[PDB]
Amino acid sequence: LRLDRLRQFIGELATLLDSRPDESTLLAQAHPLLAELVHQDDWLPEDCARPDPQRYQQYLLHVDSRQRFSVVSFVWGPGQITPVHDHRVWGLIGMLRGAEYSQPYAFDAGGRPHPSGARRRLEPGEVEALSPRIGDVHQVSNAFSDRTSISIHVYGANIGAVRRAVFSAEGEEKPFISGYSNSRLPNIWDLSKE
Ligand SMILES: [Fe+2]
């Protein structure tokens, strides 16, 4: 495993964040950092790539000391899908293997959510951005019904601890905390094992 590439990404993102950019500058300059990471699929620990039959898995890879960001391996078993939901922090999503569909939503005056633009297909190597400022609400699904798809997510917080919400088609808001699938993180720092 090329865990040095993951270490490099974490270091460089933290370096960008050290210059205290606004969200727009951050998303713009971190976009190529993550695309470079997901351009080649040779680093993700198999532990953090494992699908589950009932639900997709969320494997935490790294959290910044000051929680300025977290890096999560998002794993879709065949045909799995999220409900419509928000994030409340900035996010960058890089596709690793397989593919996923992403449909942005927006609310009318009465609460009800509607698709607010074209559904997007994210191919391996591609990166998309989200945040409360530029659009925070979407529904995501595995683009395939016959395979496992994986995307790497970077959020502007410890996303598993962020209190957010899911929305029904009728617009019912329900409190949501995603948590994480792994009770143990991969050790990506023991260089003497490389
Ligand atoms: Fe999401």
Swiss-Prot record:
Q: Mind telling me which InterPro entries this protein's record contains?
A: CDO_1, RmlC-like_jellyroll, RmlC_Cupin_sf
* Additional information: Does not contain a cysteine-tyrosine cross-link observed in all mammalian cysteine dioxygenase (CDO) structures.
Sites binding Fe cation sit at: H85, H87, H138
> Main EC class of this protein?
oxidoreductase
This chain's protein is named 3-mercaptopropionate dioxygenase
Instruction: Please give the cofactor(s) recorded in the UniProt entry for this protein.
Output: Fe(2+)
Which segments cross the bilayer?
none
